[PDB]
């Protein structure tokens with residue numbers, strides 16, 4: 513269990529690393545809907561999620577198991593797929609980062 517959470521933390525650090533920054537950056541911080549002019553964001557997305565929040569939860573030992581961690585990372589991608597039309601660049605970025613996540617998550621100890 514501790515082992516599985518270390519795997520999860522490893523994945524998190526990878527998603528935040530420079531290697532993936534070209535497509536990970538939209539997911540680093542909470543969506544600032546006002547700043548981006550997205551005045552419908554919080555009406556469509558009722559459970560915002562982002563990598564800084566996942567990191568805080570990991571650092572605070574909020575996550576009790578790998579499934580809980582994965583549900584939050586996946587929620588983050590789902591919010592992007594819900595809000596944005598599927599041909600938008602940010603959706604392509606989400607799909608690429610989700611590929612990174614899913615392939616490594618699958619190597620669960």
Ligand SMILES: CCNC(=O)C[C@@H]1N=C(c2ccc(Cl)cc2)c2cc(OC)ccc2-n2c(C)nnc21
Nearest residue numbers: 537538539543548550591592595596600601602605
């Ligand atoms: C075309 C305008 N679209 C938007 O503003 C939606 C927004 N779109 C982007 C976004 C990201 C990358 C590109 Cl190339 C174009 C738009 C976005 C950019 C951010 O920069 C700090 C943070 C969150 C974002 N994000 C996420 C996450 N989900 N939808 C969006």
Ligand code: NI
Nearest residue numbers: 579582583586
């Ligand atoms: Ni899940």
